[PDB]
Copies of this chain bind each other. A is one copy, B any other.
Amino acid sequence: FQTFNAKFDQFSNDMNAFRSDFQAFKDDFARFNQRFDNFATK
């Protein structure tokens, strides 16, 4: 079980890095969407 737990902790860290990378992309997308809306209005 304690091998499994160490393996789970690594997995959890990987998934939390994934969550963070998605959060970064979501912010980059929001900035793009604002730039698009500015371009399209003009």
Residues of A within 8 A of B (CB): 1, 4-5, 7-8, 11-12, 14-16, 18-19, 21-23, 25-26, 28-30, 32-33, 35-37, 39-40
Contacts and interface: CB of A to CB of B under 8 A. Distances in A.
The complex is assembled from copies of this chain, and their number is 4
Nearest to A15: B15
B35 A40 contact: yes
Contacts of A37: 35
Contacts of A14: 15-16, 19
A36 B32 contact: yes
Nearest to A37: B35
B16 A19 contact: no
A11 to B, nearest CB: 5
